[model samples]
Target chain A: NIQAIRGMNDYLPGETAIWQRIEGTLKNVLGSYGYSEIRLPIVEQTPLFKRAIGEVTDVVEKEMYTFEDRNGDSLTLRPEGTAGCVRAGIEHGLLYNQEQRLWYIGPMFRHERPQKGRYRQFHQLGCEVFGLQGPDIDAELIMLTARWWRALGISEHVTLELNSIGDEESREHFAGLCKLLESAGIAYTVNQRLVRGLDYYNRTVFEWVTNQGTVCAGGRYDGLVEQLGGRATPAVGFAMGLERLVLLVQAVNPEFKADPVVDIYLVASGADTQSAAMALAERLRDELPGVKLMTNHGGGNFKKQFARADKWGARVAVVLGESEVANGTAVVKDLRSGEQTAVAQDSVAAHLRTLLG
Target chain B: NIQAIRGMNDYLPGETAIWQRIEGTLKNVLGSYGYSEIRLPIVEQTPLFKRAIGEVTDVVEKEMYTFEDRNGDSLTLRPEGTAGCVRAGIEHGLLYNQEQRLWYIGPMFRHERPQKGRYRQFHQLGCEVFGLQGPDIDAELIMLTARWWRALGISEHVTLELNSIGSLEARANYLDEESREHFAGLCKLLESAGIAYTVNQRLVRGLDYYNRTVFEWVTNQGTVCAGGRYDGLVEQLGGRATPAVGFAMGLERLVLLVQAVNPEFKADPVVDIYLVASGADTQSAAMALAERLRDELPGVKLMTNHGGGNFKKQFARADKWGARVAVVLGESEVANGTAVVKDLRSGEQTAVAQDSVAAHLRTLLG
Candidate 1:
C-alpha cells in the first residue's frame, strides 16, 4: 500500500481543512498586529544551527534531519524558527531597522521518535520581533498570543506562562548565579537539561503551555542574530506545535472537527431535479455575492446522499427527487435539527436565506 | 555565514509576504468554493509515485528526491499532488465518500535544475476531486483555477488548457494505444515516462495521460496547470484509480514575474509611518495605537522608537523605512487622543483624530 515517509503524515481531506483554518486565521490576525509573513527555508546550512539555535540544544545535537545534497552542501531540515528568523534579519540587514515583526508557517523536519501529534516532519506557526526592547513590547507579544488563542477558541485550553529572561544586566546576574552553581557543582542535580538546550535564550523566555501542558513554547534570543552575523539585535518569538495544538483543541471541542464548507449539499434523484440543481448552483455562484453553492454530481441513493451530507456537515440538504420536482418543490432537510422543509422551486433562494440565517 | 540548501531558495522576509498573499487568497477562494484543505507529507512511499502518478512519469523516474528511511522503507519527497492526494484519500477512507474536492498548497521538492522561475524545492497549489466523472465537474475544477488567477489579478495573464483522459472505456482505448507504442518508436523517447510524458495525440499532447481532451494551460509567459484524466492512478494508489483528474500550478513561476498584478511590488518593508516615543510611558502609548493603525491601514508599517533620545537618528530610521508619514508622541501628545502627524510625503503637519488617523494618513500617503 502507498504510505507517507516514516514519521511523516498526510492530513486527509477532512483533517486538512482544520489546518488551513488555523493558518489562514493566523496570517490575518498576525498581519493586523503588524507581523509581516516570513517564509524561511525548510533546509538550512549546518552552521546556522550550531550558533543561532545553539549547538547544545537537542534540536541541534540530535533529532536533526541533516543530509548532504547533491552539491555536497550539508543541510538540515529546520527544527525550529527563531534561529532562521534571526538569520533572515541578519542577511537582509534588518537588524539596524528599529521595528520588525515577522511570522512563518511551514513544514519543519527533525528525525526523532514519532508519537501522537509529533512527527519527524511537522508544521508550525511562529513569529519574531526585533530591535524593540521594552516590557510593553513583551506584553504586546503576549497579548498577540492570547488574541490568537481566543480566535481559535482555545483560550481556556492554554495557560499563559510568562517569565522575564531578564535584560542584559539581569542576564549577567543570572550568568553569575549559574557560574556559582557550577563552581559548587549543584546545577547538575537540576538537570533534566533545560538551560543548556535553551542556551540561546538571553532574556524574557516564556511559553504558553496548554492544559495537557506546553503544546507551544518560545523564548527571547537576544544574541542569536549576532551569532548569525548581525549587530546584536534583541529578538523574541513564539512557536505553536500546530499538530499537537489541533489535536488537543479537537479533543476538547467537537466544533473544531474538520468538514467541508458548503452552502447546500445538493442530492439529485432525477434527471430534471439533477439538471435544475446544477443550473441553480451555477447561477447562485455567478449572481450572488458572498454565497457559495454546491450540487453533488454523485448519483447515489438517499442513504448515500444523507451520509454525504453528514460528512460535509451540511446546514441544509436539498433532495431534488422526481416527486418533489413534479410538485415544484424540493425537500430541504436541516442536518442539525433533522427538520424537513419543502419550499417552492422559485422561492428556494428566499427559503434558504431565512433557514440558513 | 549561513545559507539555504543548494537550489532551495528562502522566500526571504520581503519576498515571503507575496507568497503569503498568494497562499492566503488561494485558500480563501478555494474554501469559498467548498474545497476543503488537505496537507500530505513532504515524502511518500515510492509506489505512490510509481503507480498513482504513473510509473513512467519524469517525476517518478528521475526528478524525485528518494531515500530509504531508518526503517528501510523506500521513500521520496512528493513531486506532485495527485499521487499524495489519492493516497491520502484511500488511507483515510475519504474515497469511500463521494464527491471529495481536496485543496493543498505547500512545498513540493524535485531534484532538478533550478531556473529563473524554477527551484529544486518549489511551492504548488493543487486540487483533486474524487468520485466525480463528468464535464461539469471538470469545468468546476477549471473555474476554481480561474478563480485563483482572477484573485491574483493574473487572470488576463493566464490561459486555461484542459483535457479529459476520458471515462473507463476511452481511457482503456488510449492505454492500449500507449502500451502498443511502448514497443514502437514512441517508447524510445517516451516509454519510460509517465502519463504526462508518453502518449501524444491531437487530443493529448507532449505530456501523458490519455483519453478525452487533455488541458495544457499557458500564459503569454509560460505553462500553468497541465492537467488530464488518469483512471489507473487511483487503483495504483490502492483505490479503484476510479476516474480522477486534477492540476498542479507552479508557484515559483507565479512569483518571479509580474504579470500586471499591481506591478508585483518588491515585498520590502516599505514604511509609511514611524511612531517615535522618547521614554517608556510614550512607548506604551505608541504601542497600543500603532496596532490600531496596522489594522486600519492594510499594508502600513509602524516602527517603534529604539529607546534612544536620538530623534535625528530616529528621523533617519523613518527615512530608511520609506516613511510617508511620521507620528510623534511625548508627554504632551499622550494627554490628547491626537498626535503631531507629519506627512513625510508632502512635509505637512496636522492634528488628527486617533480613530480617523489611519484614514488621514492613507489620504496623505495614498
Candidate 2:
C-alpha cells in the first residue's frame, strides 16, 4: 500500500481540528499586533538560500531538497521562510523606505531524519518586521511573544533567554524597556554565547525555552536584506515550529478538547423523503449561518438512521418518515435529553435552534 | 535583484487581507455543511499522482514538480488535491465503511504557462466527499456551491453545467423524480440516453476514475469550478471500493471574479491609531501607553512611530499611513499628564487626560 513519505505527515480528520485551532490562534494574534500575512512560494532558486543563509551552513550544504528545474535552473524547496520573504520583499520593492510587519505560516522543507516531533516537511509560523532599527520593536516582539505564552496558558512552563551581538548601547536600550517586563510578566537572563546557530543574525537574539526544548528562537538580522540583493534594511523576526508547539500544547493541557463533530443530524427514514430531507437541511443552513448539519444521504430504516446519528455524536436527530412527510410535520428527537417532539416541517429549523441553544 | 519564480506571485501586505477574507468566507461556508478541513503534505511520493491522476494526463506527464529524495526515492509536489486525499484515505483506512466530507485549501504546483488567471504555483480551495454514491450528495454539493455564489453576490453571473457517464437504476430514478430546472437542462439528451461508458470527445475530463457524474460551474469570466463522481478511485488507490465526488476552484480565478463583481472589495486598513512621540522620555511612556491601548482594544491596529523625528515629520508619516487620528506625546504633554489627539481627517486637535485616551479614541473613531 502507498504511504505518506517517510517524514512528511498527513493531518487526519480526527486530529486536524487541533491544528486548525493552533493556526487560527496564531493568525488572530499576529493580526492583533499589526502584522500582515505574506505568502511566499514553497520553491525557490537554490542560490537564494545559498546566498541568504550562507553556503557554509548545514542547511545549504546538506538539508535542502535541491534539484535542477526543467529549465536548468537549480531549484530547491524552501528550507526556511526568511530567505524567501526577503527575496519577495526585494522583488516587490516593499522594503525600500517603509516599515513592514509581516507574518507567514506554511510548510518548510528539509531532508532530516524523522523524529517524535520532527519531519521532512514541517510548518513554521514566522513573524518578520523590517525597516525598524530600534530596540523597542525587538522588545515589542518579545512582549508579543510573551503574550502568546500567556494566552496559550504555557507561560509558567517556559523561560525567555536573551542575548546580543551588538555593544552595550543596544543591550542597555533593550534592558531599559522595564515597563514591558512589568506588564508582560517576563524575565530574562543574558547568554553571551547565543548565536542562534544561524549565519545572518547580527544583534539582539533570544529564545523561548521549555523543559521539552527550545520552542522558539530568532534574532535581529540587519544584513540579510543586502545579502539577498536588497538594500541595507534592518530586520528582526522569529519562527516557531508548529509541530513542537502543538505537542507542547497537548502535553501541557491534556484536557484540550476538539469541537464536537455534529450539532444536528437530519435522518430521512423512508426513501420517499430523501429529497425532502436534503431541502430541509439546506433550509436550516440558510437560516443558521454556522450550523453543522449532517444529512444522512443513503436511504436507511429508522433504526439504522438513528444508530448513525448516535455514532456521529449528534446532539439532536430530526426524523422524516412517511407519516411526517405526508402530514407536513417532522419528529425531532434530542439524543442528549432523550426527549421527542413533533413540529411543523417549516418551523423545524427554529425548533432545533432553540433546542441547540 | 532576486525575484520570485516566473509564475508564482507574492501576496504582498496590501493584497493579503483580501485573500484572508476570501478564505474566512469559504471556511465559514464549508463549516456550515459539516465539512472538516484536511491539510496534506506539500510533497508526496511520485507514484501517488501517477497512479491516482493517471499516467497519461498532462498534470502527471508534463506539469508536476518531480524530484528525487536524498534516499533515492522519487518525490513530487502535488499538482492537485484529490490524489493526495485519496492516498491519505487509503493509507489511513479512512475510506472503509464510513462517510467522510473533507475540504482543503493550499498551494498546488503545475509547471504550466502563466496566463491571466493561471500560474506555475496556484492556490485552490477544494472539497471531497466520500462513501455516499447517491445523487442527493451530488445535489447537496451543487446546492452548497449555489449558496456560495448567492452569499458572495455573484449569483446572476454564473451558470451550472452538468453531465453524467454510465447509468444505474438509481441514477435514472433520480433524473425522473427531479425537475429539469434542477439540472439546468444543458445536457438533457446525453443525460437521458444512458450513454455507455464510452469516450468523451469534449474537453470535459480525461481521468479514468470518473465513471458517473460530471459538473462544472462556469462564470461569465471562465470555468471557475469543476468536479464529478469517481467510483473506481478507492480500489485503484489501494483502498476498499468506495464512492467519492469532489470539486476544486482556482482561488485566483475566484478572487478575480469576486473583485470584478465587487469593485470596492479591499479590506479595511491594518493601522487604526498612529502614535507619535517626541523626546526619549516621552517615547518610552508612549510605548507603554500603546501597549495599554492594545490590551484594551485588542482588534485595533496601533502603530507607534519609531526612530525619533519632529512633530511635523511624524504627522506626515501619520497622514501617509492614512491613520484616522494621531496622538501626540511630547515632553510637555507627558509632564502635564495629557495627550493631544489630532483628527487628521478633520484637522481637529483636542487634549484629553492621559488615562482616558483609549476611551476617547474609541468614541471618536466609532
Candidate 3:
C-alpha cells in the first residue's frame, strides 16, 4: 500500500477541525492588532534566501529545496518567510518610504529529518512590521503576543525571553523596552548571550519559549531592506511554528476539543418524497442563515435514514414521508429530548428556532 | 529588483481580500453540504501521480516539477490534488468500507507556459465524494455548485451542462434503464432544487477515466468548474472498488470572473477604530488600555498608534485608516483617568472615564 510522503501529514477531519480552530483564533488576534495579511508564493528565487538570511546558514547551505526552473533559472521552495517578505517588499516598493504591518500564513519546505515537531513541510504564522524603530513600538509587538497567549488560553504554559545584540544604542533601547513590558504585565528574561544565528540584527530580538522549545522566533533587522537594495527601513518581525504551537496547546489544554455537531439533518422516506424533500431543504436554507443542514440522499428507509443522521451527531431530524409530503407537513423530531411533532413544511425552520431556544 | 517568479503572482492587499471572500463563501457552502476539509501536501512521490491518473501522461512526464529527493527517491510537486487525496484516503483506511465527503483548497504546481487565467503555480478548490453511485448524490454535487454561484452573486453569469458516459446497456439491465434512468432522475432533482442546466451530448472530460455521468459549469469566459464520475481510480490505487465523482474550480479563472462582473464588492476594512495616544509616558498606558479594549471589544478592528506621532498627525493617520471613531489619550487624559472618543465622520466627541472607555467605544462603533 502507498503511504503518505514521510514527514508530510494528511490532517484528517478531526485534526483539521483543531487546526481550523487555532488558525481562526490566531487570525483574529492578528486582526485585532491591525495587521493585514499578505499572500506570498511558496517558492522564490534560491538566491533570495541565501542573500537575506546569509549564505552561512544551514537553511541556505543544506535544507533548501533548490531546483532549476524550466527556463534553467534556479528556484527553491521557501524555507522561511521573512526573506521573501523582504524581497517582495523591496520588489513592489512597499518598503521604499512606506510603513507596512503585514502577516502571512502558509507552508514552508525544508529537507529535515522527520521528528515530532519538525517536518519536511511545516506551517507557520508570521508577522513583520516595517518603518518603525522605537522601543515603544517593539513593546507593542511583545504586548500583542502577550494578548495572543492570553487569548489562546495558554499564557500559563508559555513565557517570553528578550535579547539584543547591538551596542550601547541597543542597550538603551532594551532598557526602555523592559518597563513597557512590565506595565503590560508581560515577564521576560534578558538573555545576554542569546545570539541569533543570522547576522541581521541591529538592536532587538525575542522568542516565545515554552517547555517544549522555542515555539515562536523574531528579531529586528534594520539593515535588511537596505541590504537588499531598498531604502534603509527599520523592521521587526516574529513567527510561530504552527505545529509546535498546536502540540503545546494540545498538551496544556488536554480537554479542548471541537464539538462535532450537525445542527440539523433532513431525512426522506419512500420513493416520491425524496423529490419533495429536496425542495423543502432548499426552503430551510433560505429561511435559515448560518445553519448546517444535510439532506439525506440515495433513498433509504426511516431506520437507515435516521442512522445516517445519528452518525453526524445531528441535534434534530426533519423527516418527510409519502403521507406527510401530500399533506404539506413534516415530522420534526428533536433528538436531544426525544420529542417529535408534525409541523407544516414551511415552518420547520421557525419550529427549530424555538426548539433550540 | 528581483521580480516574483514569472507567472507566480503575489496577491496584494485588495486582491487577497477578494480571494479571501471567495474562499470563505465557497468553504461555507461546502460545509452547508456536510463536507469536511482535508489538507494534502503539495509534494508527493513521483510514482503516485504516474500510477493514479495514467502512465506517460503529459502532466506526469512534461509539466510536473520532478526531482530526486534527499533520500534518492523520485519526488514531484503535485500537478493536481485528487491523486494524492485518493492515495491518502486509501492509505489511511478512510475509504475501504466507509463513505466520505471531503474538500481541499491549495496551490498546485505545473511547469506550463503561463497564460492570463492559468499559471505555472495555480490553485484549485476540489471536492471529492466516495462510495456513492446513485444519481441523487450526483444531483447533490450540482446543487452545491448552484448554491456557490448564488452565494457569490454570480448565478446569472454561469450555467450547468450535464452528460452521462456509461453506455445505455453497460450498467443498464432493463432496456436502457440503469444509465438513462439515472440521468433522467438527476435532471428531475435539479429541477426540483430550482437549478438550471443544459444536456450536452459530447461532454466527456479531458480525462479518460470518467464513467456514468459528467458535468461542467460554464461562464462567458470558459468552463469555470468541471467534474465527472471516476469509479476505477480507487481500485487502481490499491483500494477496494469504490465509486467516486469530484470537481475542482480553477481559482484564477474564478477571481477573473468575480472581478469582471463586480469589482466593488465589500472587502475587509483595515481599521474600524483608531486608538490615538500621544504624550509623555503615554505609550504604556495606551498599550495596556488597548489590550483591555480588545478584550472587551472582540470584533472591532482597533489600531493603536505607534511610531510617535503628534496629536494632529495622529488624527490624520486615523483619517488615512478610514477609522470611524478615534480614541484620544494624552498627558492630561492619562492623569485624570479619562479619554476622549471622537467620531471622525461627524466631528463628534465625548469625554469618557478610562475604565468605561470600552463601554463608550462599543456604543460609538456599534
Best lDDT among the predictions, by candidate number: 3
TM-scores for all predictions? 0.79, 0.93, 0.96
Worst 10 residues of 1 chain B by lDDT: B189-198
In the range A70-169, model 3's lDDT, one tens digit per residue, is 7899998998888889888888877876778889999998888888878989999998999888898788888777777876789998878888887678
Error of 3 at A349 (Å): 0.9
Give one digit per residue, the lDDT tens place, for model 2 in B102-209: 999899999989899789999889889999876777777777787888777777777766655553443455433332332333243223322112223353465556
The global Cα lDDT (0 to 1) of model 2 is 0.81
Evaluated on the second chain alone, the candidates' TM-scores are 0.76, 0.89, 0.93
Clashes of each: 22, 0, 0
Candidate 2, residue A207: the lDDT equals: 90
Query: What are the root-mean-square deviations of the candidates from the true structure over C-alphas?
Result: 7.7, 4.2, 2.3
Q: DockQ of each candidate's interface versus the true one?
A: 0.33, 0.59, 0.71
Each prediction's whole-model lDDT (CA) = 0.66, 0.81, 0.84
The number of the candidate with the highest TM-score is 3
Which 10-residue window in model 3 chain A sums to the lowest lDDT?
A255-264
lDDT of 2 at B227: 84
